[PDB]
């Protein structure tokens, strides 16, 4: 089997992407944030504290004839950005772009933190990291991809995120029309439960490539590119007027400035992030100070190849017995 779904930016800045997901019988369609950095499929629901729901579409398990309470199960998650949610668990039928999993754990939120309430466009998350990170207790549950894997034509999914435009998540096949050149595959460590890999280096604009190992995660659920402070400093030093603002919480730059591209290495291959992808607009409405899309990972404890990086590539998440990641230009 295969599936194919369009993913759409939630706003004009590509702060996140939402993909429609059918849950239950009859189908209830929710727009979920596909997150290769986590491993829980959780949704706003009829069980979510009323004051914490503000425009989201909810899953109502009592209206699904295929929903079954996962008795005794609870879940609770905290994300790198400080947000969190928790609740109980049902199993139900979940379909993405034509691909159907029966008995998928659907984690129903009883509580969500303010950032989730305040974002009316995201109805939940669909985790695509390794199932070892799943927070359901007492019995850890599998991701949608893990459940689908054996049925797929090939045990892979691909992320093809758009710049200021829709893109595509595919399951079970590689669309050879969706990228240029070849796909370069690189080793993955699953030891922390992430799609963790090692970039071979970077270049800033037309500068020479610096060969240096950068360990990080391919994370569709993180907006920006977070890299070591040395790398980030070298980038922003090429932007006139850029500075790191402690009050804002990262590098900002005058919108009148031209942003250089940023190149990262995948083996001997190179992915070029165009300068425009690194512009995240005014820090506040009407401000001439713009927020940068490449920021320091210092104090995150890991480097994160978030959407800024991934949207410059066609990315293969290969769930073969020994997982790997593939990157192509597009």
Curated annotation (Swiss-Prot):
Disulfide bonds: 255-290
A GO MF label: aspartic-type endopeptidase activity
GO biological process: proteolysis
Enzyme class: hydrolase
Peptidase A1 domain: residues covered: 17-328
EC number(s) from the headed UniProt entry: 3.4.23.22
Active site: 35, 199
Keywords: Aspartyl protease, Disulfide bond, Hydrolase, Protease, Signal, Zymogen
Reactions listed under catalytic activity: Hydrolysis of proteins with specificity similar to that of pepsin A, prefers hydrophobic residues at P1 and P1', but does not cleave 14-Ala-|-Leu-15 in the B chain of insulin or Z-Glu-Tyr. Clots milk
UniProt family annotation: Belongs to the peptidase A1 family.
The protein's name in its UniProt record: Endothiapepsin
Organism: Cryphonectria parasitica (Chestnut blight fungus)
Gene assigned in the entry: EAPA
């Amino acid at each position: 089997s295969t599936g194919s779904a369009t993913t759409t930016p939630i706003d004009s800045l590509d702060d996140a992407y939402i993909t429609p997901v059918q849950i239950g019988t009859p189908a209830q369609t929710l727009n979920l944030d596909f997150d290769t950095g986590s491993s829980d499929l959780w949704v706003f629901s009829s069980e979510t504290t009323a004051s914490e729901v503000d425009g989201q579409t909810i899953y109502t398990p009592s209206k699904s004839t295929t929903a079954k309470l996962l008795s005794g199960a609870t879940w609770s998650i905290s994300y790198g950005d400080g947000s969190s949610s928790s609740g109980d668990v049902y199993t139900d039928t979940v379909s993405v772009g034509g691909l159907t999993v029966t008995g998928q754990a659907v984690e129903s939120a009883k509580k969500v933190s303010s950032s989730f309430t305040e974002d009316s466009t995201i109805d939940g998350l669909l985790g695509l990291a390794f199932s070892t990170l799943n927070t359901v207790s007492p019995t850890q549950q599998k991701t949608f991809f893990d459940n689908a894997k054996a049925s797929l034509d090939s045990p892979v999914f691909t992320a093809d995120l758009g710049y200021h435009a829709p893109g595509t998540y595919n399951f079970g096949f590689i669309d050879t029309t969706a990228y240029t050149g070849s796909i370069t595959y690189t080793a993955v460590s699953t030891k922390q439960g992430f799609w963790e890999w090692t970039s071979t280096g970077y270049a800033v604009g037309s500068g020479t490539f610096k060969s240096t190992s950068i360990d990080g995660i391919a994370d569709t659920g993180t907006t920006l590119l977070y890299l070591p402070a040395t790398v980030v400093s070298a980038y922003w030093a090429q932007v006139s007027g850029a500075k790191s603002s402690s009050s804002v919480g990262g590098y900002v730059f005058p919108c009148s400035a031209t942003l250089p591209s940023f190149t990262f290495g995948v083996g001997s291959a190179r992915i070029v992030i165009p300068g425009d992808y690194i512009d995240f607009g005014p820090i506040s409405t009407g401000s001439s100070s713009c927020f940068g899309g490449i920021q320091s990972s210092a104090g995150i404890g890991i480097n994160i190849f978030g959407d800024v990086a991934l949207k410059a590539a066609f990315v293969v998440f290969n769930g073969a017995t020994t997982p790997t990641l593939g990157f192509a230009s597009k």
